[PDB]
């Protein structure tokens, strides 16, 4: 009787389903969540009279529709379009080279193009509809404002380390963006994989190739699967003897099946539409005092700042510089980010040993954490690397039968180091990880695993006759703080010939190493790491209570209320009688 | 009149089938239980104005349709997609090879590997309709609640191991996952199983392979079952002859029989919607203080160190390391996990024999556990190898009729060596398995079995004339605390050329012995071990009541009232009139 | 007006017919009993909207399809599937090579493959439409909860052995497990039986024998059954010869008949929906102090032990040791069990003969029972081989016409021997046996019996002439306490060449008896030996009545009320009033 049910028994339309407002993944071309509140309480329509629209939306009518004849050759995948998030993907920002390559339409593409040697070609019959923006003026949604309170709160009780993780936590659920405007339409691919030396020779002769690229996709709607095609004449018999895959999809409309004309499917598109484009702006825009009046003015300025470091350090991650170019050697295959590391000699490292020791600052008592963190030789110069502190909880029981439980926390700091007639490697292994050596978490044969970092294995042989099979050369650790000394005989890379990995993310810090195996580059594409980075804090900061808020630059001062009511600002004669009772 | 039904009478649309919120087993890909409330009040439905959703669920609408036109070639069985569960089974964890590897579709898929020494392809018609998704703010159901508040108490009255006990019914009713998105759709799957060596001699034409495989699945769904084929030309003619097998299954949609359009599969595709893809998250994820309101702070954090140890131990039973490479000689078909066992010599090993001792420590009277818990030696250096209490409860009845009934317990523990001219070997079985030199739970001829770990035999002759057809070699025991010094002439392995396997799991600590036989090795797969990995408490523990809880480092107290009513906080007040009357 | 009809008037809908919660017995694969309360009170649906289910059930729908078009070949009946309980019988457990086997579909198929040296080959069309899985939280129903309460009474009593026959009145009538989880579907298979001798010339062409048989299946369901058929071309012609049997069975949907269209055959299965596979849990499993909450704590794990004995009896009897290949010599039909007692050599064993004596204890008056428990030798060194107590009751009548009866009892403890110029051996037959020397309860010609057992006959002669046609050899009794000390010339077992056969179970324990026939191992296959393995007790213990239960390890205590009331927690002032009464 309220909301859409409302507005949908009087008026007895549909409801218009490509809406904006939400939020949206950029690595991930996904979207979650609604950042904006959408209502219906005026019962707006398109001014069709066709659908049912929100209050705070417009529409305008395109009513365009595309039908190309050619199909166009992308050869690269670096350069990707994307064909429904294109307008979103290339936005400029410092992550454009990182935007949408962890999508599922990414990860097929370049997949059958290094596998195979190939080249793509697509063809398209697009079709757009409508396009549906939001007005400047508009309200944040219920549940996405109580939890930008939560994150304000954590920050002004003096609770850092909370407040980070539920600032991860909120593009775990939002994204990183939020689309402002999409595209109601419905489109028709077909897309093929060439051999790439079938190009090669038709240089002059490229157009004769799409040409027919485009003439087999209207056969394949047109007609039905079997052969009354009219395409086979001259080069559609090596066409279809150098494609290595093919597959058409329609993303919008009724369902795909060889042999139904494209009059028949044009006509299903009404009521099924679907975003075939869509644009936006990221999270951290819409977190201004315009939006929340109700926290102070500098308040709302340190909360975006907040969740504009969480969602820089989601594409900090992610991001595996390497090289690229296909041809040449060394190439890497999880590389997604060009380095300048192809064609790059290589020069052979040994490394003595690696070593950790632990001090045990404050949890003398009941908790023994300086055995495990500890690990000394088997058998130069060492380098510290990193200043990890690792803090435990346990629990007494005081017993009286009635009893009483405290909870302390155990503080062991630990430090890990490594030498720059010498131990041999076997590759690493982790708890989010496994060793490629072996496919699976185990040091080969004649290889014992020792730790380094609390949490991963290094697979490590002293012989010279045996373990010589699985060996593989060394080129040296670094960290988001200290680069390592063997690039440039300091910079944060690999030397030449040598590929990073990544390796126990601990605390907003990520450390490197760099091998030369060729074995560790290939496999699968490695899927996205998603936030939190950071496990839950044990709550060990006590809560600070702040009640007035002011800024010395132009004299403005809120003062919080009793009760907890909210944050009014701050009259001349009130905060006269404030500071001293605080002061 | 409430709940679905009153929302159904007023629409009179059908529900959407196809939600998440339940739990998820992703070690066999089954969901199980219901995680998450849902409620049908406010008679939402999909903007579509077609199925009925939840309150606290979103769709978003996809409507695409893919169709591919050629096979997909996947050779080994280590990286293993799933067609239904894929972005679950590849989240970011310790135990990543080993997710999926104990459902029907992977299970059988090894087997046509092995056995046929064959390579699969698969061709699909997918079709993905929407996204469901749940809010972020959410709440836990009704019967999930009372569970966790369960572990709770029997921690905070001084039980552990039956805290423990709890955890672990919790991991076998609800999984290890809680899924938070699933995508609505249909399938159509079609898989053969092709000889490997038709692969290695057309390695230039892998494409012509791929693309006659695509061509019979589009003959076998549009034509009728007799003859009537567009693809017997040239190489449908060994396709046939090199296969080994052969399945066309639907996911979702009418069901499939040889003989129907396509243009019919797809227009029977709505009101039959399953979930064909899916993602989600770690079940103690969504144990913290924002979901349980009740609970204070720091006792929530121990509920959930309890049930992620829980499901830790899960994964660490049900994985199996050993040698994979097929073609190589001491390879094992049990093992899902690869060792770098592969390739490796052997050396022979004398043992002496085992030998088994027990305490009595307080059961002395009425019950005589000394007697069956000892083993002497029939006929090197011994290793102790456990240290392990046996505890068992009897009856009084003192009689006065009336009478009354005491239960008491009886400990007894034991010791089981083994010694580092010799007893050979001729197996062991259990209580939860058997004598593979057998098939059945017996030692072979001229051998005596001897009990070792209270539950198991140990297959022994002393001789060497007659028990020297079912003699094996024996490469020695090790726990999950002592590892065997046998390996490296320390870590807890086998040696080389030998294979290990599980034995007597014993209150979260499995042993292991390795073998060389490949007669063990071979069989049928093993089905997946499910938790509880403990018997039940005696109850032995006595309640100790806890009423203030409190931690020191942020001065936060929790103060437990009379009648058990709630945890409320604890004012400054009160607590100082508390802790007197505790201590 | 209430339960199901009236959810079935409002809604007008079926009810799915294949729930789970009832017993299952897992040696004959039958279901019995109903262990779990199952209540329509919400008037829920399948959310179809479909189907109406019981308020604790929740289902998952699956809407899937197999279709094979390879049979598959399981040559050993010793690893056996099953199709319809595959689930369930492959558990891990001590008897999982017992489980399924005494089920129709086991012992036919045992006996196609023996009688004609053959293996099998199945083909299957599967079609699985829902999953039907109970809740955690679940009640037990009405009159499965009244017979635990009578187990429970007899325990409290101090009448053991009425408690024990009590819970084998359980195991009959509620099986040995609970189902948990069903998969509601319709199958549809053929089964056919090659000759051996087929598959060993066709190793390389395996893969066209069974291509052929899954050709085969599909003309036989899409033709009618006059000769319209596509498969006669080279290999149909001796896989039609070489074939020994054939049968096609459907287990859902509508009644199978040879010509039906596949797609005429999967429109029928809607509303004819049947278990296809399903899984389950023990019956002692669902015994613990939280489905019964009234009785006291460990009272329950008392009556949880005395079924958990009772089910592990059944498993015991039934067990069928023996040889197991087939082409070997010694071949034991009967044996469901290996034991390695293939390939063994004989030694024959001369027997003085067998006697029994009785002690006639207390009935010394009006009833003689010491003149047929007395056997004396008919003509070494003899062995006690069993302590048995015989009990008889019967009936004074004191007159006075008024008069009155009192019931005694009559002990008489009985011993029977046998010695390890000899007496021959004819075979036995019992009062559940017959000799199958005669397929008859007599001896043959020449031939006398003598009691052994109080139950059996002994087929005895003393000739060298002409009772030396039936004269079989002899190999040694033992029990279930005492091995023969033939075998390791101690172990309970025969020696090499012979076989053992049940006879006389005497309260929970069985003696056996080696043979070497020929003429005792075949024939038909045996039934399941069903509980009750005692006959019912005399009532002669006195009932001894309890009122206060407790634990001395956490100090709780139950006290009974008066009336009967229930048992209730022991308050620390009540039960120190109630024991100076008591003691
Ligand atoms: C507010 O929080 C900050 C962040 O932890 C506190 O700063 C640290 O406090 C510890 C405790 O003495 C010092 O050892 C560190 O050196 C401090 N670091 C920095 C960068 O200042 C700060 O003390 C807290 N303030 C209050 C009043 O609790
Ligand atoms: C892949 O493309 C190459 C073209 O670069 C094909 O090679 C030509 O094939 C035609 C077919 O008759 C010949 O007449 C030409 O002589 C070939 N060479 C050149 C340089 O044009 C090749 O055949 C294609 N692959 C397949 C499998 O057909
Ligand atoms: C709380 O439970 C723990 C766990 O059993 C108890 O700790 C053990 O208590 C026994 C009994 O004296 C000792 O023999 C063990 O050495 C203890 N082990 C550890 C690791 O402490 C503890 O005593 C219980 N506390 C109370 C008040 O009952
Ligand atoms: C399995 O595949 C092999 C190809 O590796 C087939 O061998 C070829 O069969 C064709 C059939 O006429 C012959 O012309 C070729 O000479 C064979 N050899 C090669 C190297 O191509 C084999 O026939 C297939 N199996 C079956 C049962 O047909
Ligand atoms: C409770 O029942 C048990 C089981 O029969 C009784 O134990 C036996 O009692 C007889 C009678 O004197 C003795 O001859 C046996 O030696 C006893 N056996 C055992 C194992 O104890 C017991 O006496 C009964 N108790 C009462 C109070 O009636
Ligand atoms: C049972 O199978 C055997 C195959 O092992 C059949 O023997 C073959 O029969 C064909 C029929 O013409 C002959 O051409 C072959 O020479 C036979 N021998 C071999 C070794 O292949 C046998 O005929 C089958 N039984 C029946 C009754 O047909």
Tied chains: 1, 2, 3.
């Excluded at 997949?111 to 079709?127: H, S, Y």
């Amino acid at each position: 009787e309220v909301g859409v049910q409302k507005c949908k028994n009087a008026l007895k339309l549909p409801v218009l389903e490509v809406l904006p407002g939400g939020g949206w993944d950029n690595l991930r071309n996904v979207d979650m969540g609604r950042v904006m509140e959408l209502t219906y309480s005026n019962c707006r329509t398109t001014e069709d009279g066709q659908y049912i629209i929100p209050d705070e939306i417009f529409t305008i009518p395109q009513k365009q529709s595309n039908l190309e004849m050619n199909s166009e050759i992308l050869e690269s995948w670096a350069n990707y379009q994307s064909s429904t998030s294109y307008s979103i993907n290339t936005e400029l920002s410092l992550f454009s080279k990182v935007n949408g390559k962890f999508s599922t339409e990414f990860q097929r593409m370049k997949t059958l193009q290094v596998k195979d040697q190939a080249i793509t070609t697509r063809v398209q019959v697009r079709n757009l509809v409508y396009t549906v923006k939001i007005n400047p003026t508009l309200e944040l949604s219920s549940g996405f404002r109580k939890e930008l309170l939560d994150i304000s709160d954590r920050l002004e009780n003096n609770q850092t380390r909370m407040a980070t993780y539920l600032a991860e936590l909120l593009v775990l659920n939002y994204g990183t963006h939020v689309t402002t405007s999409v595209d109601a339409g419905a489109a028709l691919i077909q897309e093929d994989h060439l051999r790439a030396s079938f190009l090669q020779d038709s240089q002059s002769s490229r157009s004769a190739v799409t040409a027919s690229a485009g003439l087999a996709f209207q056969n394949t709607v047109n007609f039905k699967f079997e052969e009354n095609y009219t395409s086979q004449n001259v080069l559609t018999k090596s066409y279809l003897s150098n494609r290595t895959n093919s597959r058409v999809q329609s993303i919008g409309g009724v369902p795909f099946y060889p042999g139904i004309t494209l009059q028949a499917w044009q006509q299903g598109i009404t009521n099924h539409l679907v975003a075939i484009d869509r644009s936006g702006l990221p999270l951290h825009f819409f977190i201004n005092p315009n939006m929340l009046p109700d926290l102070p003015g500098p308040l709302v300025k340190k909360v975006s700042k907040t969740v504009e470091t969480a969602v820089k350090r989601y594409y900090t991650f992610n991001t595996y510089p390497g090289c690229t170019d296909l041809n040449s050697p060394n190439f890497n295959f999880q590389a997604n980010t060009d380095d300048g590391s192809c064609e790059g000699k290589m020069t052979n490292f040994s490394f003595g040993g690696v070593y950790q020791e632990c001090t045990q600052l404050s949890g003398n008592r009941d908790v023994l954490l300086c055995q495990k963190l500890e690990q000394k030789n088997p058998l130069y110069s060492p380098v510290h690397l990193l200043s990890q502190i690792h803090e435990e909880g346990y629990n007494h029981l005081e017993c009286h039968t009635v009893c009483e439980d405290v909870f302390q926390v155990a503080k062991a700091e630990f430090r890990a180091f490594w030498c720059v007639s010498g131990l041999l490697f076997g590759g690493l292994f982790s708890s989010k990880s496994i060793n490629p050596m072996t496919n699976a978490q185990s040091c080969p044969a004649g290889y014992f695993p020792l730790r380094l970092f609390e949490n991963l294995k290094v697979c490590v042989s002293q012989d010279y006759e045996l373990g010589s099979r699985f060996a593989v050369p060394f080129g040296g650790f670094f960290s988001c703080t200290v680069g390592n000394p063997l690039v440039d005989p300091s910079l944060k890379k690999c030397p030449g010939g040598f590929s990073q990995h990544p390796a126990l993310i601990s605390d907003g810090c990520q450390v490197s190493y760099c091998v030369k195996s060729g074995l560790f580059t290939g496999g699968s594409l490695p899927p996205a790491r998603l936030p939190p980075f950071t496990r839950p804090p044990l709550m060990s900061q006590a809560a600070t209570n702040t009640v007035i808020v002011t800024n010395s630059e132009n004299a403005r001062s809120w003062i919080k209320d009793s009760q907890t009511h909210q944050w009014r600002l701050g009259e001349p004669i009130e905060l006269r009688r404030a500071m001293n009772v605080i002061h």
